[PDB]
């Protein structure tokens, strides 16, 4: 097996999600089905899916195009809020593990109020007082530190409580903050927003209290260039600092498009992967709505291929992933007729790479991933899922497992693909078609016979029999192994009343009779073999039938005319033997008949055959 522990667990989860859609059940939450395995690994992966769920848990317009949802200002706004809610809660967990040694340890004693937690967080991260703080303290801590880390944790209420106990010190900041907490989308009114920004810009552009600076332009979304590096030293603190500063419809203003493009264009992977920590960059792209970038990026880490494919599937089963129309493009690209700030993922290629790894010895699991390509076609019109099953069968040669083995008793035990579509007639011909083009007739027959395509089964069975008609049928020979399959196809084609056009069909049952004629001839059962050839009315034995038999030879399958030489000789040698054992006249007359027939028929080795036939007739007299 080519699948690692993690990859295998995901496969099982994707089998469920397929079993549900294959039986018409409720469309379960894919993101939940993937996070179910994440908990079996380190929390590096669990915290990823947590971000994936929260970033995709946005009210969408079902049955709407992918590009439309992702271009709409409506959806683009909720992404920023879902991310900020993740950066705030994520930071809140950092503040817990900073005070208590373990999340469990914090829980048993009880998570304290965000206010008392933050206070018990300031104790550690600033033990001694910084001399540059302003506006005094509140219950033993600087008022601005409390406000910042409370807003950072996302509890505006806890921050407003701090403000209520410092009404005299904070001046007019109270009426401004109380408006920020009330107004939605973390924005103030243009009039009041103007009043505070100008005040900050007036004489507080450079204040000795960094926490004061941070809060002001987090509330006013100002000084976008100043990264407030004094307080936002971590990467998440930067993302959170900026997403609280982005704006929507000229100076000192930043928008999501600029920010998202500004980040990866100027400070690409190189900047965010110098510490050899891959998820850091992924979180930067995913929490900025650049899902295709983050997916391709994370898909290149050979250790995190599994995770990047699935986060792509989630975005794909939620009409959020922007697929690349052309299949000839690179993995990541920007369509020419699209805005430059969005990118597109060649989803077809993405799955095709992941599959090649474990498609060789783990076919069942491969199909589960090929199903997501059911909705796509190629330039030639083939259904992508169907084509992927053809290529996977041509390579793996797993016919019984994937296509269903058709035993020699008339049964068709369904295969693994039967689960996904009930119309399995084309691919069985596709797989049968190539194997036919590769001279693998004995297989192409079994495959065509699996799809009950007798036109092709009998055609190929005619080719495999004609060479072996006069041969000696011996144990385990190529004659027995082909005759016995032909008879197993004769019964199942009569018991089920199946037949190809009379040309193909007539020749097929005719060869089977001839194969019996030589099997009796090679055994010495002369009398019995003579009777068979007489029924077939293939070789004339009375002079009257020569005219009609000669005309019939003209339109009989060349697979029959080929073996005419051996038939005449065996029949002659049959009469020849019976002569040495009135009757003499009758054999003599029949001997003549064979000669005149052979004389009027142009066929294989007519030279040596016509001569031998005449000699055997002379010895009779």
């Amino acid at each position: 097996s080519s699948l690692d522990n993690i990859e295998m667990a995901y496969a099982r989860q994707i089998y469920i999600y397929n079993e549900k859609i294959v039986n018409g059940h409720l469309q379960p939450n894919l993101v939940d089905l993937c996070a179910s395995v994440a908990e079996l690994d380190d929390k590096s992966i669990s915290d990823m899916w947590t971000m994936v769920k929260q970033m995709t848990d946005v009210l969408l317009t079902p049955a709407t195009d992918a590009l439309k949802n992702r271009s709409s200002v409506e959806v683009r706004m909720e992404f920023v809020r879902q991310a900020l809610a993740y950066l705030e809660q994520s930071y809140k967990n950092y503040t817990l593990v900073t005070v208590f040694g373990n999340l469990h340890q914090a829980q048993l004693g009880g998570v304290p109020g965000t206010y008392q937690l933050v206070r018990s967080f300031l104790n550690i991260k600033l033990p001694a007082p910084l001399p540059g703080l302003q506006d005094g303290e509140v219950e033993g801590h600087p008022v601005w530190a409390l406000i910042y880390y409370c807003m950072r944790c996302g509890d505006l209420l806890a921050a407003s409580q701090v403000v209520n106990r410092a009404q005299h010190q904070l001046g007019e900041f109270k009426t401004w903050f109380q408006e920020y907490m009330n107004s939605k989308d973390r924005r103030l009114s243009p009039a009041t927003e103007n009043k505070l920004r100008l005040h900050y810009r007036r004489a507080l552009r450079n204040n000795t209290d960094p926490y004061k600076r941070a809060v002001y332009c987090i509330i006013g979304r100002c000084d976008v260039t100043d990264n407030q590096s004094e307080v936002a030293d971590k990467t998440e603190d930067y993302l959170w600092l900026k997403l609280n500063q982005v704006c929507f419809d000229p100076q000192d203003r930043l928008t999501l498009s600029q920010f998202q493009k500004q980040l990866l264009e100027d400070y690409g992977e190189s900047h965010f992967t110098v510490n050899q920590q891959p998820f850091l960059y992924f979180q930067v792209l995913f929490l900025t709505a650049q899902f295709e970038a983050a997916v391709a990026f994370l898909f290149r880490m050979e250790r995190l291929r599994c995770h990047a494919v699935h986060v792509a599937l989630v975005l794909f089963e939620l009409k959020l992933l922007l697929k690349s129309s052309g299949q000839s493009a690179q993995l990541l690209s920007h369509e020419p007729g699209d805005p430059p700030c969005l990118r597109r993922l060649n989803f077809v290629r993405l799955l095709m790479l992941y599959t090649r790894k474990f498609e060789s010895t783990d076919p069942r699991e491969a199909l589960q991933y090929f199903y997501f390509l059911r909705d796509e076609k190629d330039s030639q019109g083939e259904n992508m899922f169907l084509r992927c099953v053809s290529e996977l069968v041509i390579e793996s040669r797993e016919f019984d497992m994937i296509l269903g083995k058709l035993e020699n008793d008339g049964s068709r035990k369904p295969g693994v693909i039967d689960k996904f579509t009930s119309d399995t007639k084309p691919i069985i011909n596709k797989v049968a078609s190539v194997a036919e083009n590769k001279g693998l007739f004995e297989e192409a027959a079994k495959l065509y016979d699996l799809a009950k395509n007798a036109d092709k089964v009998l055609e190929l069975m005619n080719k495999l029999l004609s060479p072996v008609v006069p041969q000696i049928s011996a144990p385990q020979s190529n004659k027995e192994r082909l005759k016995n399959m032909a008879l197993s196809i004769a019964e199942r084609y009569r018991a089920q009343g199946i037949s190809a056009n009379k040309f193909v069909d007539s020749t097929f049952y005719l060869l089977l009779d001839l194969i019996t004629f030589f099997d009796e001839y090679h055994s010495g059962h002369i009398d019995r073999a003579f009777d068979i050839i007489e029924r077939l009315k293939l070789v004339p034995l009375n002079q009257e039938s020569v005219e009609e038999r000669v005309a019939a030879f003209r339109n009989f399958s060349d697979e029959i005319r080929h073996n005419l030489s051996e038939v005449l000789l065996a029949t002659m040698n049959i009469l020849f033997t019976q002569f040495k054992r009135d009757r003499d006249s009758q054999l003599r007359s029949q001997a003549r008949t064979l000669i005149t027939f052979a004389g009027m028929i142009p066929y294989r080795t007519s030279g040596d055959t016509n001569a031998r036939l005449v000699q055997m007739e002379v010895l009779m007299n």
Partner: protein, 246 residues
């Protein structure tokens, strides 16, 4: 062919009609011709498991082989794409039983858009005069004989509901975006709903407004924009509270 295999997978009326079937009946009586049709139909929808009656068989054969695959985007997509191609050529002749089975098989192989496109095509072919649109625009007078034309479209529209239903079901919990770009589950949602909004069948869009209302999707219906939906409501308002509220 494999006979008893058919017989075992038959009805009882079909099994018992074959039991007492004489050659005389086969040769010169309708019930005998009818059963012959049933039997050939069974062996055709099994090797798939008049250029109209021939194509329909090959289409079932193509779709049956698709489901028998290991999932090869090239082979699966090819078979599916072709199956749809063929079915559409004989859309007007498709029976409710053949359409249902086909759609179900396509749904199982994640071919949602394709399934929907077939249903719409079949609806439009069984009524090119739009007898249904006029019958609805006339208040649906009982005793009229356009009802048949409307019913044959309603069978297609219902099957479209099942497709969209199974789609949201199959992808319940799946994210719309992974690592930034869209997943495969998301693109199939867009591709499917595209086919829906790309239609010009009016009885269909009426049936879909009613369907959205039923499922409770004020999300999408209030977001159409179009007056067409307003005008449709303006007629149905004085009639139902739920519609008037919309």
């Amino acid at each position: 062919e494999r006979v008893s295999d058919i017989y075992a997978r038959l009805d009882a009326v079909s099994q018992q009609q074959l039991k007492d079937l004489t050659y005389e009946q086969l040769f010169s009586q309708t019930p005998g011709k009818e059963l012959a049709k049933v039997l050939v139909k069974a062996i055709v929808n099994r090797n798939i498991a008049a250029p109209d009656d021939v194509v329909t068989f090959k289409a079932q054969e193509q779709l049956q082989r698709a489901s028998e695959q290991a999932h090869n985007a090239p082979v699966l997509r090819a078979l599916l794409a072709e199956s749809l191609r063929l079915f559409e050529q004989v859309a007007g002749s498709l029976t409710p039983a053949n359409l249902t089975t086909a759609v179900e098989q396509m749904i199982s192989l994640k071919y949602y858009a394709g399934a929907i496109q077939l249903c719409l095509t079949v609806a439009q072919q069984k009524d090119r005069g739009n007898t249904a649109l006029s019958w609805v625009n006339d208040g649906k007078p009982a005793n009229d004989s356009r009802k048949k034309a409307f019913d044959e479209r309603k069978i297609c529209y219902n099957l479209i509901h099942q497709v969209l239903d199974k789609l949201e079901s199959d992808f319940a919990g799946e994210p719309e975006l992974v690592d930034g770009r869209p997943t495969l589950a998301a693109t199939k949602r867009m591709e499917a709903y595209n086919v829906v909004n790309d239609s010009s069948d009016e009885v269909f869009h009426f049936d879909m407004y009613e369907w959205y209302i039923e499922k409770g999707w004020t999300d999408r219906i209030l977001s159409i924009d179009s007056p067409h939906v307003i005008t449709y409501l303006q007629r149905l308002a004085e009639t139902d509270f739920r519609h008037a509220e919309l």
